[PDB]
Amino acid sequence: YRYTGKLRPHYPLMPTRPVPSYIQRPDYADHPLGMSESEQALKGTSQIKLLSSEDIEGMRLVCRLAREVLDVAAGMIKPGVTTEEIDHAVHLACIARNCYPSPLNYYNFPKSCCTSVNEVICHGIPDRRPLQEGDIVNVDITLYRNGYHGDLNETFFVGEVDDGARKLVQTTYECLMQAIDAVKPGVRYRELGNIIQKHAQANGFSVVRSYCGHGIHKLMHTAPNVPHYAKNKAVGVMKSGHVFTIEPMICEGGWQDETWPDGWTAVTRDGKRSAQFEHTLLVTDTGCEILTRRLDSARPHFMS
Ligand SMILES: N[C@@H](CC1CCCCC1)P(=O)(O)O
Ligand SMILES: [Co+2]
Ligand SMILES: [Co+2]
Ligand SMILES: [K+]
């Protein structure tokens, strides 16, 4: 394998971390290949669940807990901390909230969060690498509570960063929020990529094509599929009671991606930086509820 940039994996990984049995587990947790029967059973379906009031309560709670765990991770970001140390903290913070760390064993993913540095687009695996001053690092948190998943992510700066890092991360955050601002009943899911791409392209960045936002509730990934680039062909129209994420990945160079031999880590083919932000959203009768928002503080971590 020819690496696309300066990043490398830092092995060995710690043996996988157990979750106590009193924590309720998603189906794939105990499947030998980490397959989710319940997702596979809706593979190829375009139909979007209309959440009940009970379902909405469940999503509100797990998403608030997921935000709390993200905040824990944001607190740890400093030069010299390893990504594995972040993941260990995350793992304990999930268990403390009586939640299962959704990524753990999802299709045999080895860790309890995703940590994506610099040219990593998404799904980086926490490992023994200490964060370096000038890195950008995204932490993606997904929790499972009482049969509901909640999903969010933010990009952080490690110490002082360059102006290019600042612009990339600001633009990516703006892309997400412009999309969110458009969410309401009657909007086609395909429009959001037109919005994102327009803002990315205006700032000289490209938009990853291979990974999309997604429905989420009882399943971690389900309908709708939500592309982040323009002129996509996504199926569906927003209605009150839909829950889904929007999670644009924006790049300094070209949009093309490839995957490391680990089967997870997605990197820019050119080795240039990429940043991401993610929220889980509920469509209401007039607009949307950002389930993973901060309740206590006006701005994402990288501004603060
Ligand atoms: N939270 C992320 C999913 C995660 C699935 C579990 C295994 C690692 C990637 P994503 O839906 O890409 O935001
Ligand atoms: Co995520
Ligand atoms: Co997601
Ligand atoms: K990145």
Side-chain angles (χ1 to χ4, degrees):
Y1 184 75
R2 182 185 200 163
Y3 286 94
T4 77
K6 303 178 203 137
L7 206 70
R8 300 286 178 283
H10 284 54
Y11 296 138
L13 303 184
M14 289 163 187
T16 61
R17 298 186 180 285
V19 180
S21 61
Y22 60 78
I23 303 289
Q24 174 183 335
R25 310 154 76 73
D27 57 13
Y28 57 87
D30 301 300
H31 187 288
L33 302 184
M35 298 172 151
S36 184
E37 229 76 295
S38 71
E39 291 174 2
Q40 285 169 316
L42 289 177
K43 184 178 171 167
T45 298
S46 286
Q47 193 128 239
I48 304 164
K49 184 184 179 81
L50 294 162
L51 270 61
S52 76
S53 332
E54 184 178 300
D55 290 333
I56 288 162
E57 296 308 311
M59 289 299 283
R60 282 165 174 160
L61 172 59
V62 64
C63 287
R64 166 174 77 74
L65 299 170
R67 161 59 61 180
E68 297 178 358
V69 172
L70 182 57
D71 287 350
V72 165
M76 291 184 77
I77 305 303
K78 69 171 153 84
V81 183
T82 68
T83 51
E84 262 186 333
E85 286 164 356
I86 295 160
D87 171 86
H88 186 191
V90 161
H91 188 81
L92 289 173
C94 289
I95 296 167
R97 288 163 179 83
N98 279 267
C99 294
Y100 182 95
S102 307
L104 182 65
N105 204 51
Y106 184 73
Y107 296 82
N108 291 150
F109 187 80
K111 287 290 187 185
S112 300
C113 68
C114 309
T115 54
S116 304
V117 177
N118 293 336
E119 63 271 42
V120 180
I121 290 168
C122 71
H123 305 168
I125 295 166
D127 68 14
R128 304 181 65 85
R129 183 183 175 280
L131 298 171
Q132 299 179 6
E133 181 102 3
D135 289 346
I136 65 174
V137 60
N138 179 286
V139 182
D140 192 332
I141 297 305
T142 305
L143 276 51
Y144 182 71
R145 177 82 188 249
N146 193 30
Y148 300 100
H149 298 269
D151 186 3
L152 77 160
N153 77 51
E154 294 186 13
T155 306
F156 312 112
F157 297 148
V158 183
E160 301 298 299
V161 301
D162 69 29
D163 293 337
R166 274 192 279 271
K167 183 182 180 212
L168 180 60
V169 170
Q170 181 68 38
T171 308
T172 299
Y173 182 69
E174 287 167 351
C175 285
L176 170 64
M177 296 309 306
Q178 294 186 17
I180 292 177
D181 283 357
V183 176
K184 60 185 190 184
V187 177
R188 286 192 172 83
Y189 282 101
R190 73 187 187 217
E191 187 55 20
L192 293 177
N194 287 332
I195 298 171
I196 289 161
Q197 182 170 336
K198 178 180 226 298
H199 191 61
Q201 206 141 262
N203 286 277
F205 304 133
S206 57
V207 179
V208 166
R209 297 176 75 90
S210 299
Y211 294 94
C212 299
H214 55 88
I216 181 170
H217 39 78
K218 289 184 158 172
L219 308 186
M220 190 178 8
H221 293 116
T222 191
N225 190 61
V226 185
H228 312 110
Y229 52 90
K231 303 182 184 179
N232 68 79
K233 253 56 141 90
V235 168
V237 173
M238 288 167 212
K239 296 202 180 77
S240 191
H242 287 181
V243 178
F244 65 104
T245 74
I246 305 172
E247 59 181 310
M249 297 135 288
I250 302 306
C251 312
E252 283 183 316
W255 60 260
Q256 291 80 2
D257 69 289
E258 63 184 83
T259 316
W260 284 354
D262 64 27
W264 286 106
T265 309
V267 292
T268 58
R269 293 203 77 197
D270 64 13
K272 293 183 182 324
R273 300 173 291 196
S274 180
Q276 184 172 39
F277 289 83
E278 177 176 31
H279 282 298
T280 299
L281 299 177
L282 171 70
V283 182
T284 58
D285 293 339
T286 58
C288 90
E289 181 176 336
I290 306 167
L291 299 182
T292 49
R293 72 197 184 277
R294 310 190 67 176
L295 295 174
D296 60 346
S297 187
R299 303 189 188 289
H301 285 275
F302 78 95
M303 294 182 187
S304 321

